[PDB]
């Protein structure tokens, strides 16, 4: 299957610069698709808690991007410009191996409000 | 009708220095127009290397100031670059209608919008940005300005009598909060968005890291000091668009002034200090009587000197014993 | 023609730090003004209290980087003020004509002049202060920085892709040649003036007392390390205006760079330790790819260790055993 997150600018409920959806369970093998609904945002790993051993992501800005689920645990992506103002995406590929590892990861301000939420969405 | 109106364009100029425009004018109303680009940069806010993450209009802390007379209608041509991360839009404190301006210039990176509205009311008036949600950070990162809107003929004394200035500076000060690290460092953002989460709670303490005229501290001092000489006259437009001070020359006074910044009110004359309300801009007149430097500031003292809310004016001419002698130097007590 | 475009002044900051710039602008040619104001001094450039009797471009040993786009203009405004006891100018690697400017920006203490040029050519480059016949006495002294002259749209690989960096720190390597009394420990003077030919006669032996990183031994090190995180692209600019030096970054590598500091030309990749010639500037690109305290420093390590020419990156991020990994820590032989 191959899964679609929308870069977007506001959502229909007030708050700003959000992937939507937010969260995303997919299988191995899997690609998502972040694709420029809206000008402005790009989506790329987050390094601090990106796992051991595999294809970093930094897709262009404006621009589309894909990911490939291949190894099986969980995926956090900023949009680099706003990754202070929360907008952050959370991608699980089958098994959640790695949830302590982004569990202790220390985001803050709306990258942790939204993220935090998005770690609840795990399914174990 | 406006559509019928002759359409002039004017050319905005950068702090302190004020466009050059008529003050009385027979000339009949008209649409002006105007230009404005809205740059997100890291500013260097003082002398030790402590930056900010500012939002700008059009390059400046403040924003130009436009001029126009009663009557005249603005038309901003309002331009936000895709080198840009954010939303922005304008709410002119001197339109009437649509949040001043706000909802019908909402425009992402890489759009732009034109808006045009009426001048009916005379006065200096606050321009800033308003994006919904973020109206606080916008405005105390530096999206604010000002739009002065002249009499017809001129400005007027509370005996209806003309008054005339020789140049008009103007100053924006800006209330800035600054975080720090645990280090008790301020801190240094790499991106925009990262200053966010930070700043609104260094806001909500109310306490400014600092207080600055135009963008740094010492922005209006040594050799970028205001100038003017003995038997010129000076208009003063004070603007602040979030947070109240009280403006003061030392060693002057303020002619006339205008501090709800309204110019069909009758000035105020002969004052020491003055008050320019958080959200107003203000305006004063002062002739100059004698050389030296003075220096113009917020008489909160520590605003002033401690937090950066002061500059300079280097004035010209000849010394006048009259008003002020030394009669005796310091010299040993007998 | 330069008169006619457009004016932007642009606030300095002492190195390590380089203001805020763009790297790609989409912005036309326009005339860039600085300041710099000469500071004589007497400053202390090791742990054991030895004293240099020092000339600076705004106080610091490096001078601070200037940074433009190729097409600008550059406007130095140049102040030799009459505390100073000395006179001075400026020769910009980067311009075209009288011997770098210096014979234009001739100030005696006291005096202060302003020079304009056209910043035709990209890369990074050196400026010193060159005054007739006393030319390597000043510079070694202290008085040098760089110019970095940015292709309008950023830094390219060889292949014409673009390259980017989050941030940007500026090394000055100084050879000192600082004189001994006769009882083997180091002269102190009372004015720079006393300390020339002692330090001439030094100079000649062309053996440095110290080689430091902007101003002292250690100026780069403990709570004044330069900063960085696993996965952040910096950019090391690193001048030597008087003598040879060949920067290292231990456990790193150079991904690009221009040794011969010009940006028309393509980079070199992968470097372990790449070569600056006395009297030019370079640069070199690194993204972090693991976590730890790195040193960058010129690879003569006597040079280095014994007389100064080292510093310190602070790196935080996630460690990554792929790149390497501690199979078997120390331990006893079977
Ligand atoms: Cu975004
Ligand atoms: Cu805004
Ligand atoms: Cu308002
Ligand atoms: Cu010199
Ligand atoms: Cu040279």
Same mark, same amino acid.
């Given at each position: 299957?191959?899964?679609?997150?929308?870069?977007?600018?506001?959502?229909?409920?007030?708050?700003?610069?959000?992937?939507?959806?937010?969260?995303?369970?997919?299988?191995?093998? %899997?690609?998502?698709?972040?694709?420029?609904?809206?000008?402005?945002?790009?989506?790329?790993?987050?390094?601090?808690?990106?796992?051991?051993?595999?294809?970093? $992501?930094?897709?262009?800005?404006?621009?589309?991007?894909?990911?490939?689920?291949?190894?099986?645990?969980?995926?956090?992506?900023?949009?680099?410009?706003?990754?202070?103002?929360?907008?952050?995406?959370?991608?699980?590929?089958?098994?959640?191996?790695?949830?302590?590892?982004?569990?202790?990861?220390?985001?803050?301000?709306?990258?942790?409000?939204?993220?935090?939420?998005?770690?609840?969405?795990?399914?174990? | 009708?406006?559509?019928?109106?002759?359409?002039?364009?004017?050319?905005?100029?950068?702090?302190?220095?004020?466009?050059?425009?008529?003050?009385?004018?027979?000339?009949?109303?008209?649409?002006?127009?105007?230009?404005?680009?809205?740059?997100?940069?890291?500013?260097?806010?003082?002398?030790?290397?402590?930056?900010?993450?500012?939002?700008?209009?059009?390059?400046?802390?403040?924003?130009?100031?436009?001029?126009?007379?009663?009557?005249?209608?603005?038309?901003?041509?309002? $331009?936000?670059?895709?080198?840009?991360?954010?939303?922005?839009?304008?709410?002119?404190?001197?339109?009437?209608? !649509?949040?001043?301006?706000?909802?019908?210039?909402?425009?992402?990176?890489?759009?732009?919008?034109?808006?045009?509205?009426?001048?009916?009311?005379?006065?200096?008036?606050?321009?800033?940005?308003?994006?919904?949600?973020?109206?606080?950070?916008? $405005?105390?990162?530096?999206?604010?300005?000002?739009?002065?809107?002249?009499?017809? %003929?001129?400005?007027?004394?509370?005996?209806?009598?003309?008054?005339?200035?020789?140049?008009?500076?103007?100053?924006?000060?800006?209330?800035?909060?600054?975080?720090?690290?645990?280090?008790?460092?301020?801190?240094?953002?790499?991106?925009?968005?990262?200053?966010?989460?930070?700043?609104?709670?260094?806001?909500?303490?109310?306490?400014?890291?600092?207080?600055?005229?135009?963008?740094?501290?010492? !922005?209006?001092?040594?050799?970028?000091?205001?100038?003017?000489?003995?038997?010129?006259?000076?208009?003063?437009?004070?603007?602040?668009?979030?947070?109240?001070?009280?403006?003061?020359?030392?060693?002057?006074?303020?002619?006339?002034?205008?501090?709800?910044?309204?110019?069909?009110?009758?000035?105020?004359?002969?004052?020491?200090?003055?008050?320019?309300?958080?959200?107003?801009?203000?305006?004063?007149?002062?002739?100059?009587?004698?050389?030296?430097?003075?220096?113009?500031?917020?008489?909160?003292?520590?605003?002033?000197?401690?937090?950066? !809310? !002061?500059?300079?004016?280097?004035?010209?001419?000849?010394?006048?014993?009259?008003?002020?002698?030394?009669?005796?130097?310091?010299?040993?007590?007998?």
């Amino acid at each position: 299957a191959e899964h679609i997150v929308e870069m977007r600018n506001k959502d229909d409920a007030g708050n700003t610069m959000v992937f939507q959806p937010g969260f995303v369970k997919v299988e191995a093998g %899997d690609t998502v698709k972040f694709v420029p609904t809206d000008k402005s945002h790009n989506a790329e790993s987050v390094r601090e808690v990106w796992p051991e051993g595999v294809a970093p $992501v930094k897709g262009g800005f404006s621009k589309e991007v894909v990911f490939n689920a291949e190894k099986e645990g969980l995926y956090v992506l900023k949009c680099a410009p706003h990754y202070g103002m929360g907008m952050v995406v959370l991608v699980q590929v089958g098994k959640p191996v790695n949830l302590d590892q982004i569990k202790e990861y220390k985001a803050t301000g709306l990258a942790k409000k939204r993220l935090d939420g998005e770690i609840a969405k795990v399914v174990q | 009708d406006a559509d019928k109106l002759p359409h002039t364009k004017v050319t905005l100029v950068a702090p302190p220095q004020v466009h050059p425009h008529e003050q009385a004018t027979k000339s009949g109303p008209k649409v002006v127009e105007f230009t404005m680009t809205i740059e997100e940069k890291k500013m260097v806010i003082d002398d030790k290397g402590t930056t900010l993450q500012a939002m700008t209009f059009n390059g400046s802390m403040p924003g130009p100031t436009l001029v126009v007379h009663e009557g005249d209608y603005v038309q901003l041509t309002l $331009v936000n670059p895709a080198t840009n991360a954010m939303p922005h839009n304008v709410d002119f404190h001197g339109a009437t209608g !649509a949040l001043g301006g706000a909802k019908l210039t909402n425009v992402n990176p890489g759009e732009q919008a034109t808006l045009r509205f009426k001048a009916d009311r005379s006065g200096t008036f606050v321009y800033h940005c308003a994006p919904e949600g973020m109206v606080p950070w916008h $405005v105390v990162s530096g999206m604010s300005g000002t739009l002065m809107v002249l009499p017809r %003929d001129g400005l007027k004394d509370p005996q209806g009598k003309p008054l005339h200035y020789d140049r008009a500076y103007t100053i924006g000060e800006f209330d800035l909060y600054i975080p720090k690290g645990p280090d008790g460092k301020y801190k240094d953002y790499a991106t925009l968005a990262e200053s966010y989460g930070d700043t609104v709670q260094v806001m909500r303490t109310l306490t400014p890291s600092h207080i600055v005229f135009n963008g740094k501290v010492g !922005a209006l001092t040594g050799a970028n000091a205001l100038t003017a000489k003995v038997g010129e006259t000076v208009l003063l437009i004070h603007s602040q668009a979030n947070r109240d001070t009280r403006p003061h020359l030392i060693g002057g006074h303020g002619d006339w002034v205008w501090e709800t910044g309204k110019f069909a009110n009758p000035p105020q004359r002969d004052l020491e200090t003055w008050f320019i309300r958080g959200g107003s801009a203000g305006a004063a007149l002062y002739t100059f009587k004698q050389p030296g430097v003075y220096a113009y500031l917020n008489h909160n003292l520590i605003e002033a000197f401690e937090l950066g !809310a !002061a500059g300079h004016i280097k004035v010209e001419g000849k010394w006048n014993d009259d008003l002020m002698k030394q009669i005796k130097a310091p010299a040993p007590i007998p």
